[PDB]
């Protein structure tokens, strides 16, 4: 209704579990607030150059701007932060990409990024983190990290189920817990906020299934379920058990030694994938001390959030980390950093996160060639030390490029 | 009743907020399971040598063994994992120290370490992490880390309030949430485990109060409240607001710029302590990229758990990290690592965690001199590269010592 659909261009189609991508697909993009105004132009330009180069003019993306966040209120009016037609247009065109998003405080508005994930049921937050050679790192051996994070997106304490201290609601549920359920375990029941943490069987088996499948499809070496199950037995500990059960039941997993670890034979390469588990706080220690031992990771919403932010910091990629939210019916690729308003409009932030999310988008579309040209470009620009301000501070002998120019530097190394 | 109280020795007394420590105090210690059998002898020996050296024979600790964990079932019978008299004896003698503890699986027994903390209301988990010069680290600059963690111990999802998927209880609370509270936000209400997350005003203001107080008493530069409040507004976000409120209300905090940060003038050194906050997942990134910016940290139970484990890994101290659980009526110092049963009895694990917890014990008792001799010993043994197996693997040119012998090496560098 305020989105203008491209006259040239054809909708991607879902013909039962498989994308049928035309040569001129319409892709919805959300520009993003803050520095989205800098990074999203850089991404449209390098993706265009990568499909122009890989398919020699046969394929072309018809980009369609849709709205969410601060720009949505400037287009539809001050009150609409998430238009109902963004949800419909992402549902319809199947794959979309977005920049950083501002959620307002003061108006009872819950996180717009988590709202897109939940409203569209994009239950997989996929976070690949690997080291790009030559980026400045705080650790001695960043090259040892090559992990892919499957974070569950639709349950955990992120479901937003909570009531304020001293609200009627809070008083009411605390009353139910103490009188009807007999909980004598709340230390101070007055002036007390309450949050609900759900974890279901369906919720964890659909995310773990996608994790093992990813591991078979890419011949990864192991799947690690991380959980804090010693303290949370019926939510986090239920996640590890349902995950091992699904590896037994659906993938024909077998005990290594006398457990708990399983082996799943890859039906294509013949190799064995270890299904193991580690407690979440020991895992935060293990990615730093023994990163080469881990590969595909499956975990719940909050842990997945902490794990990927932590891992993206140790490989030097807080600003070049890609991400995707994948459901059964659509997928949303995204800059995983914030809107950083102080730099907005200055053409200086790193466009690397949304560009590498666009290569995840292209690879998902089946446009592997265009996608390999982007990570080729990326490795070469970073190796050339022809780099953005955030990388140049920490490097010696680098050439400082604006946001837009690092875009050109990715095209030059293609 | 099976503890034998020392014939020589006198109880420490609490004479309103202040410990009155005799020259021959009786200290309860829990030996610990697993490698507790190796580390606790090493600690009794170096603490004895430190008080013998500092006070030239005037002071002496009368050690009293009390029981919890696997050793408790060998002394009181197979069913008693936590004797009621351990709780009483720690309450009574005021300060105790413990080794690692085995919680059994299969018998519905919840974490014995969290049970001691809750049952005794030791609401402060204090975790000091600093780098000891010369220990092998995975990061380029471990020397930049000097932080003290005030983790809340009595609320959060750690209160153990949860019900199994498909249990009657679970069905009942899910029914209450959907019908009486109107929650349409649980994605799959069948086969669903539920955990409760409480956060009260009293609970967070008593921990934040102790954090600021610590900062005044030791002239630390800042107190950072870390929370995941953008998603959990009424538990984690309530923690940051109550913490800033307490810094305004009780410490006379003033706005820096136009907020949110506050300044608290130290009434003894005249210096300004910054009260700031950072989101928990960005913080996990910031301790690795800008560790020199943080100092005292205040946070809830789960975050505090993750933060300290992560920070102890980057300074090389997964096995030499000390810790304390402090309440208004008693304190329990502890090895913060696990029972590691494969090494138990072999005299090879690092006794460093429980020894540095004993220096926290001595400092708490007011025996500062004996306590400075232990960290003097520690720095010198580690600097001598006269070290335990876990440190020697990662170092070149080290001399390998058994557990007991690293104890002697701490006494030799005193």
Swiss-Prot record, chains A, B:
Keywords, comma-separated and alphabetical: Acetylation, Glyoxylate bypass, Magnesium, Manganese, Metal-binding, NADP, Oxidoreductase, Phosphoprotein, Tricarboxylic acid cycle
Posttranslational mods: Phosphorylation state of this enzyme is controlled by isocitrate dehydrogenase kinase/phosphatase (AceK). Succinylation probably inhibits enzymatic activity.
Sites bearing N6-acetyllysine, chain numbering: 140
Keyword check for Manganese: yes
Presence of keyword Chloroplast: no
Residues the UniProt record annotates as site (Critical for catalysis): 158, 228
Activity-pH behavior: Optimum pH is 7-9. Exhibits maximum stability at pH 6.
Superkingdom of origin organism: Bacteria
N6-succinyllysine modified-residue sites: 98, 240
Cofactor(s) required, per the database record: Mg(2+); Mn(2+)
GO molecular function per UniProt: guanosine tetraphosphate binding; isocitrate dehydrogenase (NADP+) activity; magnesium ion binding; NAD binding
Sequence positions that bind NADP(+): 102, 337-343, 350, 389, 393
Phenotype when changing residue 228 to M: Nearly abolishes enzyme activity and strongly reduces substrate affinity
Coiled-coil features, chain-numbered ranges: none
Cofactor binding, note field: Binds 1 Mg(2+) or Mn(2+) ion per subunit. Both Mn(2+) and Mg(2+) can be used, but Mn(2+) is 10-fold more effective than Mg(2+) in vitro at the same concentration.
EC number: 1.1.1.42
InterPro entries: IsoCit/isopropylmalate_DH_CS, Isocitrate_DH_NADP_dimer_prok, IsoPropMal-DH-like_dom
Binding-site residues for Mn(2+), renumbered to this chain: 305, 309
Activity-regulation annotation: Inhibition of this enzyme by phosphorylation regulates the branch point between the Krebs cycle and the glyoxylate bypass, which is an alternate route that accumulates carbon for biosynthesis when acetate is the sole carbon source for growth.
Effect of residue 111 to D/E: Reduced affinity for isocitrate
Residues engaged in binding D-threo-isocitrate: 111, 113, 117, 127, 151
Function: Catalyzes the oxidative decarboxylation of isocitrate to 2-oxoglutarate and carbon dioxide with the concomitant reduction of NADP(+).
Family statement: Belongs to the isocitrate and isopropylmalate dehydrogenases family.
Assembly behavior: Homodimer.
Alphabetized PANTHER family for the sequence: ISOCITRATE DEHYDROGENASE [NADP] (PTHR43504:SF1)
Protein name as annotated: Isocitrate dehydrogenase [NADP]
């Amino acid at each position: 209704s305020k989105v203008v659909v491209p006259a040239q261009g054809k909708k991607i189609t879902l013909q039962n579990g498989k994308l049928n991508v035309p040569e001129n697909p319409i892709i919805p993009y959300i520009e993003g607030d803050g520095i989205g105004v800098d990074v999203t132009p850089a991404m449209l330009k390098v993706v265009d150059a990568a499909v122009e180069k890989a398919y020699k003019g046969e394929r072309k993306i018809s980009w369609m701007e849709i709205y969410t966040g601060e720009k949505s209120t400037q287009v539809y009016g001050q009150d609409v932060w998430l238009p109902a037609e963004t949800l419909d247009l992402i549902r319809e065109y199947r794959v979309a990409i977005k920049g950083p998003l501002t959620t307002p405080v003061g108006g009872g508005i819950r996180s717009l990024n988590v709202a897109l994930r939940q409203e569209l049921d994009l239950y997989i937050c996929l976070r690949p983190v690997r080291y790009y050679q030559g980026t400045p790192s705080p650790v001695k051996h960043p090259e040892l990290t090559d992990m892919v994070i499957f974070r569950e997106n639709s349950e955990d304490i992120y479901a937003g189920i909570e009531w304020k201290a001293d609200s009627a609601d809070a008083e009411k549920v605390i009353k139910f817990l103490r009188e009807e359920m007999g909980v004598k375990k709340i230390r101070f029941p007055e002036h007390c906020g309450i949050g609900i943490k759900p974890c279901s069987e369906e919720g964890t088996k659909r995310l773990v299934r996608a994790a093992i499948e990813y591991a078979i499809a890419n011949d990864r070496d192991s799947v690690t379920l991380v959980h804090k199950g010693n303290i949370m037995k019926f939510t986090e500990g239920a996640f590890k058990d349902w995950g091992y059960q699904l590896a037994r039941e659906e993938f024909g997993g077998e005990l290594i030694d006398g457990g708990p670890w399983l082996k799943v034979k890859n039906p294509n390469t013949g190799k064995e994938i270890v299904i193991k588990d580690v407690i979440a706080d020991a895992f935060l220690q293990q990615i730093l001390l023994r990163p080469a031992e881990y590969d595909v990771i499956a975990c719940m919403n909050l842990n997945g959030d902490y794990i990927s932010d932590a891992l993206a910091a140790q490989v030097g990629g807080i600003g070049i980390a890609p991400g995707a939210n994948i459901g059964d019916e659509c997928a949303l690729f995204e800059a995983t950093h914030g809107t950083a308003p102080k730099y907005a409009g200055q053409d200086k932030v790193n466009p690397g996160s949304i560009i590498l999310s666009a290569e995840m988008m292209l690879r998902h579309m089946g446009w592997t060639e265009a996608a390999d040209l982007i990570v080729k470009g990326m490795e070469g620009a970073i190796n050339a030390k022809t780099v953005t301000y955030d990388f140049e501070r920490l490097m010696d002998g680098a050439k400082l490029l604006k946001c837009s120019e690092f875009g050109d530097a990715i095209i030059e190394n293609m």
